[PDB]
């Protein structure tokens, strides 16, 4: 294995952060305005909410549910949610390996790097958690994310 791969146009790809893995269910209405919470916790609320797909875009990555068919976006309040309409002024993410294991930093694209990242928090909740973009502290284990790719993570 290599740490610093990406796991790319890999469907059923999950995305973990410890062992709480990333949810996102499909939105009421499919609006431009339309969005649903990406939620961290070890329950899966629906078929293959659990299951994402990572591609290229431009500079950066587009992150895709294939349950809720939703790409993974900033919203109000810093908050990262599902939106069904792509956006490439949100939904477009930089993934920088960490330096340690097989842990990732998914950040805000910016012009000279830098930009905020994916925060799992309540830090110690047991619970469901919601992500926000906060400054990237190298070392806070609720901005570390890691992929898991099974050998049937594609099969259906």
Not at 89 to 101: A, L, R
Request: proline letters at 5%; glycine letters at 10%; aromatic letters at 10%.
């Amino acid at each position: 294995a290599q740490a610093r791969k990406i796991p790319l146009d890999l469907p059923g790809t999950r995305i973990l952060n410890g062992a709480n893995w990333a949810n996102n269910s499909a939105t009421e209405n499919l609006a431009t305005n339309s969005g649903t919470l990406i939620i961290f916790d070890q329950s899966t609320p629906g078929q293959d909410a659990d299951r994402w797909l990572i591609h290229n875009y431009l500079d950066g990555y587009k992150i895709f549910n294939m349950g809720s068919n939703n790409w993974a976006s900033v919203s109000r309040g810093n908050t990262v949610l599902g939106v069904s309409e792509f956006d490439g002024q949100t939904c477009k993410w930089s993934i920088e390996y960490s330096g340690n294991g097989e842990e990732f930093w998914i950040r805000v694209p910016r012009e000279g790097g830098g930009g905020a990242v994916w925060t799992i928090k309540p830090a110690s909740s047991q619970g469901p958690t919601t992500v926000f973009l906060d400054l990237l502290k190298e070392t806070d284990p609720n901005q570390r994310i890691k992929f898991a790719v099974d050998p049937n993570s594609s099969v259906d």
